Design an enzyme around this catalytic site. Structure first.
Site, PDB file in Angstrom:
ATOM      1  N   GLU A  77       0.824  -1.195   0.000  1.00 51.01           N
ATOM      2  CA  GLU A  77       0.000   0.000   0.000  1.00 51.01           C
ATOM      3  C   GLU A  77       0.851   1.233   0.000  1.00 51.01           C
ATOM      4  O   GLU A  77       0.519   2.248   0.637  1.00 51.01           O
ATOM      5  CB  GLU A  77      -1.038  -0.038   1.131  1.00 51.01           C
ATOM      6  CG  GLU A  77      -2.126  -1.092   0.830  1.00 51.01           C
ATOM      7  CD  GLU A  77      -3.046  -1.361   2.032  1.00 51.01           C
ATOM      8  OE1 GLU A  77      -2.911  -0.756   3.134  1.00 51.01           O
ATOM      9  OE2 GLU A  77      -3.912  -2.229   1.873  1.00 51.01           O
ATOM     10  N   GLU A 118      -6.049 -10.498  -2.801  1.00 51.71           N
ATOM     11  CA  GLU A 118      -7.090 -10.331  -1.791  1.00 51.71           C
ATOM     12  C   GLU A 118      -8.471 -10.257  -2.469  1.00 51.71           C
ATOM     13  O   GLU A 118      -9.321  -9.451  -2.053  1.00 51.71           O
ATOM     14  CB  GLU A 118      -6.755  -9.095  -0.890  1.00 51.71           C
ATOM     15  CG  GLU A 118      -7.619  -9.063   0.397  1.00 51.71           C
ATOM     16  CD  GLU A 118      -7.086  -8.104   1.476  1.00 51.71           C
ATOM     17  OE1 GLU A 118      -7.689  -8.148   2.595  1.00 51.71           O
ATOM     18  OE2 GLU A 118      -6.055  -7.382   1.207  1.00 51.71           O
TER      19      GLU A 118
END
Length: 306
Positions: free
Chosen positions: A132, A238
């Protein structure tokens, strides 16, 4: 019968490494999670137990109870493990984000990386070393690491990781890499090309793929763009889709099949109610732990393409 084949068994038949799922001791010891994961999936990622807040709540004093449960369960059940995640700005204790000194944070980051990867050395297929790290506009996210170490923290994290366990595939992982024309997707490709040109050992790009309904189609172009960065691997890490449309899910599975460097897919969880967004029922098993229409659509498409 055909009706009885696993998504993991089928994606392997098609030449891929795994079809896996995020999990942890809490899921594994409740409901029907463990039975479903044993039967349907080849690979697990710890949802929380390997994050910084969990593993180094105070400097130098590590806790591995949860992580060790996950790793051992995986080993005794033949599942590949993706370690997750080493350096990122969520799940970061405020003892870390408080540090204002470059060399102190550097050393702290390196110790955190080396400790975790040394404990499980050789048992981890791939690590999300950096998570991220990009802004939506494609610039690097101004976290404590970026602000205190500077942009060198990414190369440093990956060199350190390669030293700790040279057997693991080293990933950078991000979300919103789902549309080829989106600034974030283009930027991570450009930066990863440059970093790899300078000998940074980025083995993989991981794309979390938290999708809204209708965003499956665009992954078909976003994923080969991700692979054009030239990493040995890309992965979907994910996967979950609000509304769980068969079309959306099959589009993502097809993108994976189309991309020679894509090794596999990990979905965000097993059964809908355990989702971060449970009311959008975004997963492949429902609240009764029953496979959904998207699950059947995936199996069928995997067979049909054989």
């Amino acid at each position: 019968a055909e009706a009885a084949q696993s998504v993991d068994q089928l994606i392997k038949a098609r030449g891929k490494v795994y079809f896996g799922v995020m999990t942890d001791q809490n899921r594994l010891t409740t409901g029907k999670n463990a039975a479903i994961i044993q039967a349907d999936f080849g690979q697990v990622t710890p949802m929380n137990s390997m994050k910084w807040d969990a593993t180094e709540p105070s400097q130098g004093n590590f806790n591995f109870a949860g992580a060790d449960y996950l790793v051992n369960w995986a080993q005794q059940n033949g599942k590949l493990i993706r370690g997750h995640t080493l350096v990122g700005h969520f799940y970061l204790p405020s003892w870390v984000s408080s540090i204002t000194d470059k060399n102190t944070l550097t050393n702290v980051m390196k110790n955190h990386i080396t400790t975790l990867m040394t404990r499980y050395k050789g048992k981890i297929r791939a690590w999300d070393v950096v998570n991220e790290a990009f802004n939506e506009d494609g610039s690097l996210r101004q976290t404590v690491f970026l602000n205190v170490i500077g942009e060198d923290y990414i190369p440093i994290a990956f060199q350190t990781a390669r030293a700790a366990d040279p057997n693991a595939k080293l990933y950078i992982n991000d979300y919103n890499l789902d549309s080829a024309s989106y600034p974030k997707t283009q930027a991570i490709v450009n930066r990863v090309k440059q970093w790899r040109a300078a000998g940074v050992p980025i083995d993989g790009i991981g794309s979390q793929t938290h999708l809204s309904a209708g965003q499956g189609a665009g992954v078909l172009q976003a994923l080969p763009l991700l692979a054009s960065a030239g990493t040995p691997e890309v992965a979907i890490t994910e996967l979950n889709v609000a509304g769980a449309s068969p079309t959306d899910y099959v589009n993502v599975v097809n993108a994976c099949l189309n991309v020679q460097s894509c090794v596999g897919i990990t979905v965000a969880g097993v059964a809908d109610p355990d989702s971060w967004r449970a009311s959008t029922t975004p997963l492949l098993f429902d609240g009764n732990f029953n496979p959904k229409p998207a699950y059947n659509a995936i199996v069928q498409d995997l067979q049909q393409g054989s």
